Amino acid sequence: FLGLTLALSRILEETMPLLRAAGVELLEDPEASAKLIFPTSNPNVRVLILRASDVPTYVEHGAADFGVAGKDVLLEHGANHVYELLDLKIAQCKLMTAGVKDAPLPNRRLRIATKYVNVARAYFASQGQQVDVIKLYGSMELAPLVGLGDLIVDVVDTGNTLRANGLEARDHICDVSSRLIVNQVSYKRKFALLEPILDSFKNSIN
Amino acid sequence: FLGLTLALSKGRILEETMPLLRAAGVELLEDPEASAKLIFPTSNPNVRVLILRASDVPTYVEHGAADFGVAGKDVLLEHGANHVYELLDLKIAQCKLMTAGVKDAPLPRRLRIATKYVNVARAYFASQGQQVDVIKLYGSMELAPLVGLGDLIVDVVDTGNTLRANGLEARDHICDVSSRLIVNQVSYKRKFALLEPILDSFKNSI
Amino acid sequence: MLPDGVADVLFEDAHKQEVLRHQLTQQLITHGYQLVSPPMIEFTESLLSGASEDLKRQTFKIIDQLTGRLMGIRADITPQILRIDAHHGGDGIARYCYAGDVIHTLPSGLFGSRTPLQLGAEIFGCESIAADIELIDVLFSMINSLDMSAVLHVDLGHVTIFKRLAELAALSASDTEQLMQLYANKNLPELKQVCQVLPMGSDFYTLARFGHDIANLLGRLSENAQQDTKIVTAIDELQRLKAHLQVQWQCAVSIDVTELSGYHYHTGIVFNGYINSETQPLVRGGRFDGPRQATGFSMDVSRLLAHTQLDAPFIVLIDYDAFNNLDSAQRQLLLQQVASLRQQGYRVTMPLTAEDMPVGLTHRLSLADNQWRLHAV
Amino acid sequence: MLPDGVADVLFEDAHKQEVLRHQLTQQLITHGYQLVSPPMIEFTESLLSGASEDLKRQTFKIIDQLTGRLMGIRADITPQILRIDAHHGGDGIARYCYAGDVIHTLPSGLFGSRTPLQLGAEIFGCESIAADIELIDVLFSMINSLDMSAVLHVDLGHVTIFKRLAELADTEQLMQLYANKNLPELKQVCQPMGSDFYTLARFGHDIANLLGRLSENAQKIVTAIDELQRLKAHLQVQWQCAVSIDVTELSGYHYHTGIVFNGYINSETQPLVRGGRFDGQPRQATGFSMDVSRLLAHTQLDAPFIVLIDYDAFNNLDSAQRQLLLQQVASLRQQGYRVTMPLTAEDMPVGLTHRLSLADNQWRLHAV
Ligand SMILES: Nc1ncnc2c1ncn2[C@@H]1O[C@H](COP(=O)(O)OP(=O)(O)OP(=O)(O)O)[C@@H](O)[C@H]1O
Ligand SMILES: Nc1ncnc2c1ncn2[C@@H]1O[C@H](COP(=O)(O)OP(=O)(O)OP(=O)(O)O)[C@@H](O)[C@H]1O
Ligand SMILES: O=P(O)(O)OC[C@H]1O[C@H](OP(=O)(O)OP(=O)(O)O)[C@H](O)[C@@H]1O
Ligand SMILES: O=P(O)(O)OC[C@H]1O[C@H](OP(=O)(O)OP(=O)(O)O)[C@H](O)[C@@H]1O
């Protein structure tokens, strides 16, 4: 396969338009599909549907030439080995600390439970606070309720999920949006295929 | 809660432990698979159930946010299990950990392994005296070999259907896998009076 | 199992590395570079004098039990050459080469080595770009002598151009961090927007959008920029060096004036040498401070192993049973012959037993009718 | 400026080390030893597997940040050869050589180096003393090839003799006394088979009659005393080498499985060469190693030819004239002349011997 491989994961739903106006409308509708690799209107582009967590991995190793990854994922994973070409300004949420509603700070070293371990260590370091961090893979809202951690680091848009689970947003860590990332080799060797899709996206977000 | 907190995973484990729990005197009130609640009561008011992602059960137990859990040996081996007691083999969710590559494709150079099961991979290929580059994945791994992110994946297989359906074939057997009953080390010392009946009933049931 | 980024180099690979390390060393020496062999360990006071944060984090610390003082296992030989030049170099031109093991705490690139075999050359005490052209000449003699099918492409940059655009336009640390991140990520749109806000912003967007075309670049720059002689000379150096590489070595040269890595170490022209489509440069060179003018390059010799081939070895077994049937004088004669074959570089084994079998045997040395001769297996 | 036992090797010494390291490596390779280049660092699990207390204490520990596991900077390559042979060696005879930097926490002996350049050869899978005779022959061809004025004296020992006196009849006590040649203290401390233990110390040197001096009971020992005699004579007959014997040389008690060789240059305290039998199925093995840096003092190369192209003349050349002088200079470097294309009129190489000068359309070398 001599063309571009695109790594996508909400994001599929919000990139469809960007892709439509770039000339890359998917054949099938993944949400109801068993296929891993997906063709598209452009026969020089294929799409990999991954878990958001994995998109930066596939791109960075060149199993995908470019991907749409949340800045949450990039910050946690480390974007050292990919180019961040453009901020798509989609999936606009934020990374925040969250604890139990009205619950006070304990008289002991803070214990953070989260999938965003590196983000947690980094944030609380810049606040000059010493934290014990616990890695989680699944839903994190339970962790404070059973006292696995005092706080969680998660992505929050409105606040509904936190509140519905008895949790309240504490500290704002940073803003988050889907970013277009590119493999370093792919950018040099397949730029002729990339430039039109990049120029269309730059156009689309304006 | 002055009583026992039980950490289960939804789907297969929950489905295959229900009978063991019924005969132990712990039948769930609600039916989780269709529910939004994180913590679940039961026929015994001294037992509650946490529904977690399988990946996290050993974490919640080891830190004492759950007193005991049902975890796959796959998860225990990968996570470590240094800080919990493995009291009995429930002989449910019987699958195996295996290497898998593309069908009839041979091993190439230094292998690149893509998997969720990184520590298992490093450990296995070490005992084979084989030198490997390991790539962490979070989502389904069947795509990784097809786009050449890895030469092999390490995954759980029962029959083989999923691998074949994705153009992959099971290669090497790493070890047998089943749900194991794990206990928090403090909980076992402090709440044994509550545990003994449930343990004796399970030992009986299997 | 070995730690990530640590590998055995065994058998023919080891022989090949031995041959590379040695051929490249004598080449550098024949070009008038003085071989220096600094130690693997020093006190951190000397080893990390003027080090970056990247170099400090990359250097393993150990305690000197004799004195209680902190030492490091070098992650880079270049600073040791500085210490050596300061002591012995004098005020005039001085040339040094070196090849040595260095150790990194973390890998450079994905599954990259932590034990690179670092080979390099440096020229101290010459302002002229002539010294940069000399390093290019030595580097390319070395590379051509390896008879590789792999092609080296050279990226030229010049940190001076951007450092000057930053000074003349009085950029805040904040702003400079912004542009460098945007450059490093090829973010043209993000950069275009940000430049409409920044002073001389048009210049910063020009380096990104028109830097590749060096021959016209000065003409595209603002009156202010074109007035500054540091920028004029910098853009001149790139031209002189670019042409020399194409004309003299038939080298594909690209220009990237937004190549600002080693911002703190680099004081001017920077050359990066890429093998094929490999992400991490094989060769990292350019101008750096010592008021002692200095320029140099280094490569990980171990990264050449993949792109170099030696002729198959002749691996030879003396026939055990035949040799033992020989009288004393017959043995002296066969030993004189074996000595001759080793002179020629044949790998010959005097067998301890009838079963003693060398790895990858090619030939036995066998007796037939009063004559010892090589016979393929 | 540098820590004790840590030196630069600079300029002609560095070139000379480069030449030694290389000549000795290809010598070993031409005798059928396989070059292996193990790394400076390993996890301690592998690097110190079966290590002595001396080896552990001599090895710098460092932290792998990727895994949190302990690594070491090797103080000795020999154990890495074992690991390599175990993996690739098979069960037949196998030969390895190596050269590599090793690092010690503390100096070996008085004013010893902590950064020796370790060069060595090992033979695995042969019981016969024949393999020890092969190592001796290879070592002595290597040493003779250096055309040194310095003489190597070889001390032979055999740990088996004492290991047997120990079995057939404290150990740390005698070894301390032996290690210090403390005869009176040893004589007293002799009072099971005590007479034998004091005899090894007092009569070890005279190997030819030593068996006769040992207790009838004590008379492995027979063959051990034989090995020493075979090796001693071989070194005198074949290499005209002064050989002394010390059966109380138990330095490497933990590693050494039989015959041991130490090679001393002149009257220097620390051995230049440390060799003998060690274990590596019950896979037999023998080897030696030396610090290549310790040869630098006793080796001389031919003076280098260091050449300056005339700056003024070179600049006067048209393009085609420059192509031709470059072709000539390329030829001189092929021959090993060290030639400088000068950047300026003042550019002067260190230890200049010859200028390349233009006279009547011809470039020629002239001594300064
Ligand atoms: N509430 C939200 N509003 C906007 N963007 C969001 C929100 N939650 C997550 N995102 C963005 O989408 C990404 C995750 O996508 P999504 O939530 O659809 O899948 P996911 O929950 O990560 O699924 P999986 O369990 O397979 O990893 C995040 O990295 C973030 O950039
Ligand atoms: N095919 C199988 N047959 C039997 N047991 C299995 C099988 N696959 C996995 N298991 C076991 O059950 C666990 C998988 O739990 P589960 O099915 O919930 O998967 P998960 O990865 O946690 O998430 P998901 O709900 O997406 O499947 C593993 O830890 C393993 O021990
Ligand atoms: O309503 P808000 O508080 O603004 O945030 C909505 C939540 O949904 C997101 O996951 P997603 O929608 O993918 O849920 P899923 O992982 O269960 O699919 C994310 O985890 C947010 O926490
Ligand atoms: O032996 P096989 O029949 O090929 O099954 C093996 C599959 O079972 C597991 O999936 P699971 O059943 O948990 O489904 P899900 O992870 O897709 O929900 C696992 O992820 C394997 O892909």
Describe this structure in words.
The complex is a heterotetramer, with two copies of chain A (206 residues) and two copies of chain C. Chain A contains eight helices and eleven strands. Chain A is an alpha/beta fold. Chain A folds into two domains: 124 residues, no CATH class; 82 residues, no CATH class. In chain A, the strands form two sheets. Chain A has a six-stranded mixed β-sheet with strand order 2-3-1-4-11-5. In chain A, strands 8-7-9-6-10 form a five-stranded mixed β-sheet. In chain A, helix 4 links the parallel strand 7 and strand 8. By secondary structure, chain C is an alpha/beta fold. In chain C, a hairpin with a 3-residue loop joins strand 11 and strand 12. The chains are: A alpha/beta (206), C alpha/beta (377). Strand 2 of chain C pairs antiparallel with strand 1 of chain D, so a sheet runs across the interface. Bound molecules: adenosine-5'-triphosphate (2 copies) and 1-O-pyrophosphono-5-O-phosphono-alpha-D-ribofuranose (2 copies). One adenosine-5'-triphosphate (ATP) binds next to helix 1 and helix 3 of chain B.
